[PDB]
Symmetry: D2
Subunit: 212 residues, 4 copies
C-alpha cells in the first residue's frame, strides 16, 4: 500500500508532527509513505484546501497513492474539496473509532482530519491511534458483521452513482484554471514521487505537458 | 428559510428525537421545517444513506429546501453521498463547535450527523445545542475572524471547481437507475412538500414524469 | 452567585481566554466573577494543580465563592486535587452536554476543565457554550428527568459518606505544609477577594495568622 | 496486575459488553481480571454509584485489586464516590488519549467511565481502545518526557496531601451505615474474589465480622 500525506498552508506547520506518526504506523505495517507537503518551510510551494482536493484526486486516480491523508483547520474544507472529484471517497475522522468505522463501513481511499480544531496537547497521540485503527483491518469489512452486507452494498451503489455524477477526470484537468493546476503540482518532490508511481498513462502524459 | 430533515433506514427510529429538537430551534428562529422522513413507521417507503444524498440534491437544487439536516449511524456515509451531487455542500458535525465552524468557514447547505456513534444520554441535547450554533450567525463570516477573506475566497474557488467536475443535475436524474430514483421520492409527504416548494420547473416536470403525474 | 476562576502554571497563559468567556456568560446572568489567577503574568505567585485543589477548598468552604472553575492540561489532575478536600464536589467537562449533565445529575460546586488536551480552534467557543449550559437550569434537577429521585438521593448519600471520610478542613489547614499553604494564598488579589467575601470567621482567622495579619 | 470491574444498577446491562473488552486486553497482557458485577441479571445484589466508590476503596486498600475500572451513566458520579476514600486516585476518561494521559500524567489506580453519555454504536471499540492505551506503558511515566518531573512531583505531593485529608479507612468502614456496607459486599463472587486476594489482614478481619 502507498500512502500520501497532503497539507495546505494554514496547517503546514504541523506537517512534521503528522508525518512522524503516519510514518511510524506505515513503517510498522510495511506500507510505503510519501510526504507531498506542504512541509512548513519558508518560501515553499503553496496549497489551499481546495488544491489539496485536486492533488488528492490526481494521486488516487493515477494510482500514485492507494490512500491519501489530508486535512485543514477543521477538516471539512479538505473533505469537501476531495469529494468534488471522481475516484475519490474522502471521509472525516476526529477519533480512533471514527477511523476504524470509516475503514470498515465506508472503505474509502482518503481521510480528511482536523489539524486545528480539537488539536492540542496529545494531538499527535490521537493521530497515531487513529492511523493505527484506520489500517487495523482490511478496508470495507463492515461493522458489525450483521450490518456488513447492506453497508458494502450501499458503498458499491454509491460508487456506481459517482460514475454518473462526475465528469471525466482528464477533461477536468484540461478545463480547470491551468495556473491553479500548475501550482497544485509544483511541490519540490511531486515529479519524483508522482511519475515513479503513476499507472495512468493518460494523466501522466497531460501533467508532463503542463510541467514542460 | 426552509429546512428539510432526511433519515435513512438504520436511524429511522430516531427521526422523532431529531425532529423534536430541530423544530424547537426552528420555531424560535422562525424557520420552516419539512420532515421528509424516514419516520420510523412500519411498512414505510425506505431510504438508504445513498438515497439521502440524492434526495438532498433534489431538495437543494430545486429550491424546495434551503438547508438539509441528514445523517446515518456514523454520519460519514450520508456525507459522502450528499457530496457526490452538484449544488450540495454537506458538512459533518459531532459537537456544537463543529456546527458553528461549518456555518462560518464553509457556509454550506447541508449537514450530516452521527445518529448512532456517540449517541447516548444527552445526545438530544447535543442536537439542540448544535442546531442553535449552526444558525447562530450569518453563514460564511469566517473563523478565525481574521481568516475570513481566504476562507471566503476558497469557498468560492471550490464552487468554480465544482462547476467543472459535476455533470448537470437534470442529466444525472435521467442517467441514474429510475427505480432507485422513484423510491427516493416515494415518501408519503414527498409530493405535498416538494411540489409546493419547488422553484425549478424543469426538475419538477421531470420528477412528475417519474411519478407518472 | 460568586464564581471563582483558578489556573495553575502550565495553563496560566490561557487565563485571559477562559476569563473572557466566563465573564461574558456571568455578566448576562448577573453573577460575580473573581479571577484568582494565575494570570499569565511574568514573576507572579505560582500554583500547581494540587494547590488549585487546596485553593478551591478554601474558597468554597469559607463561602468566598459559590462555584469554582479550574483545570489544567488535561483537567484530571485538578479534579483529583479538588476532590481530595471536604466541601468540594468537582466535576469534569469536555463539552457542553457534560456541563449540563454535571449541573443536573451531580449538582456540584466546582468544575475542572482541559485547557490543553483538545484545546485548539474554537476551544474558547466550547468554553462559552459549556459555561452557558452549566448554568442553564437549577442544579440537581436530574437527567434523565425520570432518574431525578435516585440521582438526588445518591448525591445526598455521597454527602453523608463524605462527612465520615474527610477530616475537618480547619484541621487539614493546620496539618498541611505551611509554606505550601502560604504560597497557595499569596496571589496578588487573594487578600482583597477572600477577606471581603469569606463567611467563615474561623477559616479567615487562621489564614490571617498564616499571612501574618 | 489484578484488575477489577464494578458496575452500578443503571449501567448493569452493559457489564457483559464492558467485561468482554476488558478481559480481551487483560488476557493479551497477561493480567488477571475480576468481574465484581453488577452483571445485569434479575434479582441480583444491587449497587449504586456511591457503593461503587466504597467497593473500589475496599478492593484497592486491601490489595485485592491493583486497578479498578468502574463508571455510571456519565461517569462523574462514580468518580466522585471513588475519590471520597483514602488510597483511591480515580480518573475520568472519554477517549483513548484520555486513558493514556491518565496513566502517564496521573498514574492513579482507578478509572471511571461514561457508559451512557456518548455510549452508542462502536462504544465497545472505544472501550477496547482506551483499555489498550490505559495499560500501554507502565503508569506514571509522564507525558511528554519534558513535563514528566513536575507531573510526577505533583502526583507525589497530592498523595502526601491525601494522607492528611482522609480519615483512617478501617475507621470509615466501622462508622458508615453497616447495611450500606453489607450490601456493597454482598455480590455473588465477592467473598471468593476478595478473601483470596486480600493482603490487608485488618480489613479482611472486619469484613468477616460484617459477613458472619
Amino acid at each position: 500500500m502507498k500512502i500520501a500525506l497532503i497539507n495546505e498552508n494554514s496547517q503546514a506547520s504541523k506537517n512534521t508532527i503528522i508525518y512522524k506518526e503516519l510514518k511510524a504506523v506505515s513503517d510498522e505495517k510495511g506500507f510505503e509513505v510519501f510526504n507531498y507537503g506542504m512541509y512548513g518551510k519558508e518560501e515553499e510551494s503553496q496549497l489551499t484546501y481546495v488544491q489539496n482536493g485536486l492533488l488528492t484526486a490526481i494521486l488516487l486516480n493515477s494510482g500514485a497513492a492507494d490512500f491519501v491523508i489530508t486535512g485543514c483547520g477543521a477538516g471539512i474544507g479538505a473533505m469537501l474539496a476531495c469529494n468534488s472529484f471522481p475516484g475519490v471517497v474522502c471521509g472525516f475522522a476526529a477519533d480512533p473509532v471514527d477511523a476504524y468505522l470509516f475503514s470498515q463501513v465506508n472503505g474509502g481511499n482518503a481521510l480528511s482530519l482536523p489539524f486545528a480544531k480539537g488539536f492540542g496537547w496529545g494531538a499527535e497521540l490521537n493521530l497515531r491511534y487513529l492511523f493505527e485503527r484506520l489500517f487495523e483491518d482490511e478496508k470495507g469489512g463492515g461493522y458489525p458483521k450483521e450490518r456488513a452486507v447492506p453497508e458494502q452494498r450501499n458503498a458499491r451503489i454509491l460508487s456506481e452513482i459517482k460514475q454518473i455524477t462526475y465528469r471525466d477526470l482528464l477533461s477536468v484537468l484540461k478545463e480547470i484554471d491551468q495556473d491553479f493546476l500548475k501550482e497544485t503540482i509544483s511541490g519540490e518532490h511531486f515529479q519524483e514521487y508522482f511519475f515513479a508511481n503513476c499507472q495512468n498513462q493518460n494523466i501522466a502524459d497531460y501533467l508532463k505537458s503542463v510541467l514542460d
